[PDB]
Amino acid sequence: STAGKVIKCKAAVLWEEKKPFSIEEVEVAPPKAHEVRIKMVATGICRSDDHVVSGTLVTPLPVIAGHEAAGIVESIGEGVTTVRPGDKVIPLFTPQCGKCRVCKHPEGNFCLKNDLSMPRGTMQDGTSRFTCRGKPIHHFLGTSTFSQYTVVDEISVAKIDAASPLEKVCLIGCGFSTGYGSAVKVAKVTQGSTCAVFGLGGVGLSVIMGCKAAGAARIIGVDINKDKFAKAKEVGATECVNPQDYKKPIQEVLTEMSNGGVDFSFEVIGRLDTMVTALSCCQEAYGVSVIVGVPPDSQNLSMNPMLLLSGRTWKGAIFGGFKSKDSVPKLVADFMAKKFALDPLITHVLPFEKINEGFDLLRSGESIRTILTF
Amino acid sequence: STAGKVIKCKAAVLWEEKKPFSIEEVEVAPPKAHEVRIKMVATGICRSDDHVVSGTLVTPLPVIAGHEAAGIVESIGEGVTTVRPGDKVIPLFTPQCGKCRVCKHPEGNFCLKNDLSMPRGTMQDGTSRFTCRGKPIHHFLGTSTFSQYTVVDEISVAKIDAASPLEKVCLIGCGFSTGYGSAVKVAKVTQGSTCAVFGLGGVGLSVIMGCKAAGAARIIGVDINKDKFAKAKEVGATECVNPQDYKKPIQEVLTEMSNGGVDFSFEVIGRLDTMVTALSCCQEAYGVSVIVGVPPDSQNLSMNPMLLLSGRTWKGAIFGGFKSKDSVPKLVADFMAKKFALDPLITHVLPFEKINEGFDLLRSGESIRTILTF
Numbered sequence: 001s002t003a004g005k006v007i008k009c010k011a012a013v014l015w016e017e018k019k020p021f022s023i024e025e026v027e028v029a030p031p032k033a034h035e036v037r038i039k040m041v042a043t044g045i046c047r048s049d050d051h052v053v054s055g056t057l058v059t060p061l062p063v064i065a066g067h068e069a070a071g072i073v074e075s076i077g078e079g080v081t082t083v084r085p086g087d088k089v090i091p092l093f094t095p096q097c098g099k100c101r102v103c104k105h106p107e108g109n110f111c112l113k114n115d116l117s118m119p120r121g122t123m124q125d126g127t128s129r130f131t132c133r134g135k136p137i138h139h140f141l142g143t144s145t146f147s148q149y150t151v152v153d154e155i156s157v158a159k160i161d162a163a164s165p166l167e168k169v170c171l172i173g174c175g176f177s178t179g180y181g182s183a184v185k186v187a188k189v190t191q192g193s194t195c196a197v198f199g200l201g202g203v204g205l206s207v208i209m210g211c212k213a214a215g216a217a218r219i220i221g222v223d224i225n226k227d228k229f230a231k232a233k234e235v236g237a238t239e240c241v242n243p244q245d246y247k248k249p250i251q252e253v254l255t256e257m258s259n260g261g262v263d264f265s266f267e268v269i270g271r272l273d274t275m276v277t278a279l280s281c282c283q284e285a286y287g288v289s290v291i292v293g294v295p296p297d298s299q300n301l302s303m304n305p306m307l308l309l310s311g312r313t314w315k316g317a318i319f320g321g322f323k324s325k326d327s328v329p330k331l332v333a334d335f336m337a338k339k340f341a342l343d344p345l346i347t348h349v350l351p352f353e354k355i356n357e358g359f360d361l362l363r364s365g366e367s368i369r370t371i372l373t374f
Numbered sequence: 375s376t377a378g379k380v381i382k383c384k385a386a387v388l389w390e391e392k393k394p395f396s397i398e399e400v401e402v403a404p405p406k407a408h409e410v411r412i413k414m415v416a417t418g419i420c421r422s423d424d425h426v427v428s429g430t431l432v433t434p435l436p437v438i439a440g441h442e443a444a445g446i447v448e449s450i451g452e453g454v455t456t457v458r459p460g461d462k463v464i465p466l467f468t469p470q471c472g473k474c475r476v477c478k479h480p481e482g483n484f485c486l487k488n489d490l491s492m493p494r495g496t497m498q499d500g501t502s503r504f505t506c507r508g509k510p511i512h513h514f515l516g517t518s519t520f521s522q523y524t525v526v527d528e529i530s531v532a533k534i535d536a537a538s539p540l541e542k543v544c545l546i547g548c549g550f551s552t553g554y555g556s557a558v559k560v561a562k563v564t565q566g567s568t569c570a571v572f573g574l575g576g577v578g579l580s581v582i583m584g585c586k587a588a589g590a591a592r593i594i595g596v597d598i599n600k601d602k603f604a605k606a607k608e609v610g611a612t613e614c615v616n617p618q619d620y621k622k623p624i625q626e627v628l629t630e631m632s633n634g635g636v637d638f639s640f641e642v643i644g645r646l647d648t649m650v651t652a653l654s655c656c657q658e659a660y661g662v663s664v665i666v667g668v669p670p671d672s673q674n675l676s677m678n679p680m681l682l683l684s685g686r687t688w689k690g691a692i693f694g695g696f697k698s699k700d701s702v703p704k705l706v707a708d709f710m711a712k713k714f715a716l717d718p719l720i721t722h723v724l725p726f727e728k729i730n731e732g733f734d735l736l737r738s739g740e741s742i743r744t745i746l747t748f
């Protein structure tokens with residue numbers, strides 16, 4: 001009934017920075033060759049979406065944001081082979097083209113077709129499928145999930161189990177997989193190790209899940225909001241510390257607590273200072289620190305390279321280092337097999353029309369993940 | 375015969391920064407418990423010794439420098455069990471106490487007993503074995519090899535093959551092992567990979583040796599002194615580039631040359647800017663950059679953490695990541711079995727008495743390693 005036709009539907013359009021989303025009617029073009037049009041079922045509110053609002057993350061405006069989601073294929077363009085109308089799917093904000101040097105490399109996941117490094121806010125072919133009040137609207141990360149319908153390139157979508165609960169597994173599209181993979185795949189946390197996790201939001205809690213799954217003996221949560229500590233302990237933190245409680249820098253505190261530095265630290269906030277602190281608190285000869293948070297655009301940190309010369313390793317990753325199209329269906333299968341839990345991350349479930357209220361909960365510190373339902 | 379007695383001998387004392395060494399008589403006390411007094415046979419001139427002169431590497435003055443050396447045990451203190459008088463030995467500027475958390479860790483080598491992090495310029499017991507003009511003189515990195523005799527703690531000396539040629543294997547005490555291990559142990563260079571090596575001195579040439587040994591397909595040497603290129607090619611560089619020849623920054627050149635960034639890069643100079651350039655030139659999703667050079671004291675670099683967030687790994691190491699006391703005798707055994715060559719590193723030989731000429735050769739750019747003979 002809609003295949004081949006322009007769809008008019010509701011989306012949340014961001015017309016300019018530092019404004020509420022506008023919930024209004026948009027036109028969604030049909031998919032061109034190698035494109036997929038998805039009916040959205042559920043989408044999470046990630047801090048990275050708020051970064052677009054705040055100007056922390058720069059991407060062309062006006063835009064349809066949203067990148068953590070799940071939905072059902074409405075139609076496919078010519079030449080699509082990996083999904084069919086009716087399939088449950090998760091959009092992939094890091095694509096997997098399968099052809100580039102990164103996709104071919106055993107470790108890399110930051111596919112060269114990404115729209116992260118040099119954001120264009122379009123489909124692969126450099127155009128947009130969205131119109132609103134007669135004006136073209138940009139895509140975001142090739143996904144644009146804050147809309148009843150989106151169009152994505154085939155390399156930016158994965159088919160998942162037909163029985164999966166979309167209102168939970170949307171989190172595999174960003175927050176859960178990013179944190180969990182940062183621990184198990186990027187850091188490669190070891191059994192019996194001591195971990196420090198800076199930032200106890202949806203992503204940091206998922207890092208904790210991964211550290212516990214990996215067998216860490218101690219997992220120290222760090223957050224300036226002590227209301228975040230109870231849930232961090234539920235999912236595996238052994239101890240939580242608030243930097244504001246101490247008269248000395250928290251890297252010194254964590255170094256003392258761990259009798260000379262932690263084995264693994266994770267920055268899961270997005271601040272230059274905590275990136276350096278998290279590096280410093282890992283053991284100087286063999287510690288590993290992983291940057292997960294997204295910092296403000298175009299700002300450099302300052303650090304003393306002796307922190308590295310003694311033996312520390314510093315790395316970062318997008319999407320937990322997971323090759324996105326290969327990994328997403330397997331993560332959903334693992335969820336269906338009860339290998340990990342997603343409910344601990346979900347604090348609020350709201351209709352899509354309450355998107356602004358959902359962002360206000362995040363900004364105020366009150367929520368972990370709000371899932372919006374279409 | 376000299377056991378238990380003070381030895382008067384010649385050493386090269388550095389009384390103040392930015393002045394020639396003074397070759398003059400010092401008094402060397404006998405070894406206390408768990409100390410070893412060594413008659414030096416050969417010592418190399420490493421750029422880190424020059425860093426003491428220049429104030430790049432800060433350690434208490436006046437001082438007897440020198441850390442890349444080999445000699446013969448003259449006497450042992452009470453309780454020493456790992457060397458005997460007459461044994462050939464290499465002093466270990468990074469100790470291996472065998473008891474601390476780092477020594478017990480499978481990967482770590484920066485032993486907590488080191489005198490690098492918070493330099494005191496003493497023996498383990500906080501005192502000095504050197505007197506000159508009636509004044510106490512500091513040790514350097516627990517080794518102080520610019521002296522006809524030195525005293526070192528037992529954890530800072532390794533017994534080596536009785537037949538080894540000390541005028542060659544002194545290089546295993548620093549420059550060869552540092553560079554080679556940075557490639558084979560720290561970076562873990564893989565077969566068929568592309569490597570970039572910044573700085574083609576003694577240590578950078580040893581990194582090239584390691585990259586070639588590990589099977590790299592391309593090894594790009596980078597130096598502003600084109601006179602360094604011929605020897606770099608002899609030990610395995612496939613191409614060399616001088617940043618001075620280009621209008622574009624060399625990270626851009628190297629990214630172009632490697633069709634999108636190198637697999638492994640190494641900073642082997644000691645400049646903040648080239649540390650950042652070397653990180654930038656490795657591939658953004660899966661590249662690894664290793665800092666080997668020693669930066670100017672207390673100075674911070676500035677960098678954009680997005681370089682890490684895409685997936686790069688940044689690390690550093692002292693002494694090529696080798697656990698020193700375990701590794702040095704094995705490296706000497708491998709040299710004796712022709713598993714690697716040291717002669718390409720040695721461009722000049724001088725008597726100890728011409729130490730200042732040896733430093734002039736390093737500073738002029740003419741030498742790689744000058745070996746000084748006692």
Ligand SMILES: [N]C(=O)C1=[C][N+]([C]2O[C]([C]OP(=O)([O-])OP(=O)([O-])O[C][C]3O[C](N4[C]=NC5=C4N=[C][N+]=C5[N])[C]([O])[C]3[O])[C]([O])[C]2[O])=[C][C]=C1N1=[C]C(I)=[C][N]1
Nearest residue numbers: 047048199200201202203223224225269270293294318319
């Ligand atoms: N890498 C990748 O991929 C990624 C990234 N991301 C990031 O991360 C971060 C985080 O997120 P989330 O979790 O979502 O957030 P929230 O919830 O908001 O949480 C946070 C936390 O933190 C804390 N804090 C603050 N501040 C501070 C703290 N702590 C401590 N200290 C301080 N100072 C609070 O409280 C909370 O709790 C961010 O940054 C983001 O962005 C994510 C994800 C992923 N992505 C990327 C993308 I381009 C998209 N997505």
Ligand SMILES: [N]C(=O)C1=[C][N+]([C]2O[C]([C]OP(=O)([O-])OP(=O)([O-])O[C][C]3O[C](N4[C]=NC5=C4N=[C][N+]=C5[N])[C]([O])[C]3[O])[C]([O])[C]2[O])=[C][C]=C1N1=[C]C(I)=[C][N]1
Nearest residue numbers: 421422573575576577597598599642643644667668692693
């Ligand atoms: N880590 C460890 O352990 C170490 C370190 N270290 C260091 O390193 C470096 C290097 O050294 P050497 O090799 O000896 O030096 P030389 O010979 O001088 O070489 C260098 C080079 O570079 C170059 N450049 C300059 N500038 C530049 C360049 N290139 C490029 N760019 C630029 N800009 C020149 O020309 C030459 O050739 C240093 O830093 C040192 O220090 C060593 C060893 C080891 N240690 C440590 C220690 I305490 C002691 N030892």
Ligand SMILES: [Zn+2]
Nearest residue numbers: 097100103111
């Ligand atoms: Zn790709």
Ligand SMILES: [Zn+2]
Nearest residue numbers: 046048174175
């Ligand atoms: Zn996200």
Ligand SMILES: [Zn+2]
Nearest residue numbers: 471474477485
């Ligand atoms: Zn130790």
Ligand SMILES: [Zn+2]
Nearest residue numbers: 420422548549
């Ligand atoms: Zn050295």
